[PDB]
Write a protein that binds this ligand. Structure first.
Ligand SMILES: CCCCCCCCCCCCCCCC(=O)O
Length: 133
């Protein structure tokens, strides 16, 4: 029952500082424009110990499957080749990506009826709020 509160289909409702976050990742002008326009859905499912997280939009579709604590190689929506580990820390799903001496964190928490995604790179924090579809 590790991740029960996260399971389902979620839709983006608000975004704060995403452009700045994408700049910190090195995302170029055209991609930042088209990515910022996106209204994704995030679909989280669980089969035993395997969690699947899909992110679907008109810009890109991504899909990762993982076991908590077990590192995996990920190719992100902006085409970074990263080493990823996802853990549950006190009810928060913490996703760390490492590449090229750099790191970013993607943390997901349940707050009221929302799924709140915090993206942090260096000094920059973006918050993406999702609600159930
Ligand atoms: C997948 C639709 C959003 C578009 C992102 C594509 C270009 C930038 C990718 C940025 C890093 C991944 C950000 C996660 C954002 C989110 O799940 O809401």
């Amino acid at each position: 029952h590790m991740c029960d509160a996260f399971v389902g289909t979620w839709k983006l409702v608000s975004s704060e500082n995403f452009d700045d976050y994408m700049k910190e990742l090195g995302v170029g002008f055209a991609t930042r424009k088209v990515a910022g326009m996106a209204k994704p859905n995030t679909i989280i499912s669980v089969n035993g110990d395997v969690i699947t997280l899909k992110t679907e939009s008109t810009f890109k579709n991504t899909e990762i499957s993982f076991i908590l604590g077990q590192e995996f190689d990920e190719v992100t929506a902006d085409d970074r080749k990263v080493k990823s580990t996802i853990t549950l820390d006190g009810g928060v799903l913490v996703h760390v990506q490492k590449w090229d001496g750099k790191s970013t964190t993607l943390k997901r928490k349940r707050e009221d009826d929302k799924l709140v995604l915090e993206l942090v790179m260096k000094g920059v924090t973006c918050t993406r709020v999702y609600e159930r579809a």
